[PDB]
Amino acid sequence: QLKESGPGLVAPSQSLSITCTVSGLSLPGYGVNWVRQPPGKGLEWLGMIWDDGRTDYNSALKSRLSISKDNSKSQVFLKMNSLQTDDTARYYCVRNVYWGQGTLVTVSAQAVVTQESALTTSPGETVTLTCRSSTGAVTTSNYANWVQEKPDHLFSGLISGTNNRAPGVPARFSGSLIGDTAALTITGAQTEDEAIYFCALWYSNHWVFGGGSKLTVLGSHHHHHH
């Protein structure tokens, strides 16, 4: 439903322009976000444009960023100026729970969110992943968002708005608030759920990603008798 078109290579001190083409079934009011991940590093939120055209930016990168849209083309645009080596990264556009495939850009001549680094379960058992805010208890106004990363950079939103399950996501994924945390409960985890899980929290005008939890699902198939 979302696809990024970027230039592949950008020269140092030049600008980066990426086009996000949105196609599909689309509820109004959620805007489009831009996120990047340098190789080996964590997710960084860049900014978003709301459906009404208002923009919000990562304050540390605001002076370099411009986000725009063209509704006649069904497109959202990212521009970032003065690229340097630390801007080499995969860039993604995101609408609610829907992530583009991302586009690699290679440069060539706050609040803190915490997750368990790693958890293990076995098939069919239930596992809970948690998401903590350094500012205090997580509230519904943090709109905890949960995203699954599978190999080959496949990101899939699972939960948004604390507890709203995305369409087509298995019923075994659920979101809630537990104590001072946001929590993703995987009821009856399956071998296929082995993956990295990211949480993101909203702080009035920006998203912050947690560091991700690597979930291992340890178990082998055994003979089924009928």
Tab-separated table of C-alpha atoms in Angstrom, residues 20 32 40 55 65 73 76 93 110 123 156 183 217-218:
chain	number	residue	atom	x	y	z
A	20	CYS	CA	6.044	7.878	-1.058
A	32	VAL	CA	2.142	9.760	6.865
A	40	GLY	CA	23.360	-1.731	12.380
A	55	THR	CA	3.806	18.901	9.651
A	65	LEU	CA	13.758	18.490	6.866
A	73	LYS	CA	-0.828	12.348	-7.174
A	76	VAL	CA	3.884	12.320	0.148
A	93	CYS	CA	7.192	5.927	4.879
A	110	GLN	CA	14.822	13.601	24.188
A	123	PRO	CA	5.291	-22.553	20.673
A	156	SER	CA	4.487	-4.756	9.736
A	183	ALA	CA	2.394	-4.210	26.650
A	217	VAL	CA	10.343	-19.035	19.738
A	218	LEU	CA	12.174	-22.236	20.675
